[PDB]
């Protein structure tokens, strides 16, 4: 049950990183007004700045789930996901991405407004 809900949202998120249409604003709405985001070792306090950097600097991407774990931490009122993906850029070889996310329970109750407070996105491996 809860399982699916997550793995899906996980995908929704990946879906956004893949959508080039600078129309993006609702994506930023998945993050609340107080974050913690790291991208390839680089911190970002605002999902805004980050996503700006992304749409503005990153290339066309193609993400594919390949492992999705998670624990809902008691009292915290949230959960944490341990995600794994591969990625292509133009389409070229596949790269390995490790991604942790801290998300709010509310999502399980279909609430999606600003539930991402944790975003640790890091490339772990590349083509041979």
């Amino acid at each position: 049950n809860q399982a699916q809900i997550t793995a899906t949202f996980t995908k929704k998120i990946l879906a956004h990183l893949d959508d080039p249409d600078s129309n993006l604003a609702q994506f930023v709405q998945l993050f609340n007004p107080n974050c913690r985001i790291i991208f390839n070792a680089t911190p970002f306090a605002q999902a805004t700045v980050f996503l700006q950097m992304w749409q503005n600097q990153v290339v066309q991407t193609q993400h594919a789930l390949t492992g999705v774990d998670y624990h809902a931490i008691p009292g915290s009122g949230t959960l944490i996901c341990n995600v794994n993906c591969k990625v292509r850029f133009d389409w070229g070889p596949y790269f390995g991405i490790s991604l942790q996310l801290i998300i709010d329970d509310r999502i399980f109750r279909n609430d999606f407004n600003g539930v991402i407070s944790g975003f640790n996105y890091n490339m772990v491996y590349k083509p041979e």
Binding site: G67, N82, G96, S98, M123, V124
Partner: protein, 154 residues
């Protein structure tokens, strides 16, 4: 308390932690259960390429013996630490490889382990331990620097 955790801007605590954890994880996993509570959680998975001290202990004894090389070959691992405001704790993630032992042989294996920690009693309690074992491969993070690639956000 050898697992005492300060949130130093130097990221040294995160490194001591990962070091001490793995060490025991390689030689005496049992001793790690102290860091787990009735409500702690552990999970493992493998990439297409458990609750409470007891259950957690169970599979801990299951999982193959291993050997990491964090202190000797630092550069072969990357690490990020972020605050976990909601539980007045932190999330430490470690990327790297370890030497895996069933055909009685030694094989390399890459992994990404994520520990959710809540500092306490001049130590820490591991609320969540998410391990993902995967096909060994060179860390896309390496540099000329002989040392762990660190990142911290808050």
């Amino acid at each position: 308390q050898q697992f005492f955790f300060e949130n130093d801007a130097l990221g040294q605590s995160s490194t001591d932690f990962a070091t001490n954890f793995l060490n025991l994880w390689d030689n005496n996993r049992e001793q790690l259960l102290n860091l787990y509570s009735p409500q702690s959680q552990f999970s493992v998975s493998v990439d297409s390429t458990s609750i409470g001290q007891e259950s957690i202990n169970s599979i801990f004894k299951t999982l193959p013996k291993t050997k990491h090389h964090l202190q000797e070959q630092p550069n072969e691992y990357s690490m990020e630490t972020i605050s976990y405001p909601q539980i007045n704790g932190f999330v430490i993630t470690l990327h790297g490889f370890f030497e895996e032992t069933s055909n009685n042989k030694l094989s390399k294996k890459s992994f990404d382990r994520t520990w959710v920690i809540v500092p306490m009693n001049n130590s820490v309690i591991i609320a969540s331990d998410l391990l993902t074992v995967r096909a060994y491969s060179t860390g896309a993070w390496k540099t000329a620097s002989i040392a762990i690639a660190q990142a911290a956000g808050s």
